[PDB]
């Protein structure tokens, strides 16, 4: 049930709550930015600016 | 009992090694709590 | 050529996967954990035909017969 966009009982789960996570605060601090993609570690990294 | 054991597996993650990482480069232990006395 | 790209790979896999927790903590403990150095060794690896003396060499072929002695022999270690 926590694969669900909400569980049987219609609440939240990991998935809903790591989905709006990562588009509301990781990548949106991307376009912001603050972090970058690293190909060369395979991750998104924090940059070195004023934030 | 299950955050018993959450704290028991979180002493083995990574981050705890570091220590032991500084102190090989410029120079307790998980199960000692199930060493019966 | 095969001896520094496959210990190149090597050390960008260990690197790849080590916590990332740990090494901001090795940092913070001034025994910074460095990263390897970036490289370009796609180029050569992807020669097929080297003209050289008249022959035409498999630059390829030939690094990937000891690419593969490699990932043996680190397979026959770890066991
Ligand atoms: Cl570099």
């Known amino acids: 049930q926590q694969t669900q966009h909400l569980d049987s009982h219609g609440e939240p789960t990991i998935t809903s709550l790591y989905t709006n996570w990562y588009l509301e605060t990781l990548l949106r601090q991307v376009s912001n930015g603050h972090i970058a993609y690293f190909p060369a570690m395979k991750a998104f990294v924090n940059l070195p600016t004023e934030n | ?37 | 050529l095969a001896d520094q790209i496959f210990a190149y790979y090597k050390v960008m896999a260990g690197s790849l996967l080590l916590d990332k927790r740990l090494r901001s903590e090795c940092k913070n403990q001034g025994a910074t954990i460095h990263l390897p150095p970036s490289n370009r060794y796609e180029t050569l690896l992807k020669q097929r035909h080297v003209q050289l003396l008249g022959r035409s060499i498999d630059l390829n072929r030939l690094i990937t017969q000891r690419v593969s002695a490699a990932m043996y022999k680190s397979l026959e270690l770890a066991i």
């Open chain 2, 1 to 37: 009992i299950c955050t018993e054991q959450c704290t028991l597996s979180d002493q083995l993650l990574p981050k705890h090694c570091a220590k032991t990482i500084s102190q090989a480069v410029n120079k307790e232990k998980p199960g000692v709590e199930s060493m019966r006395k």
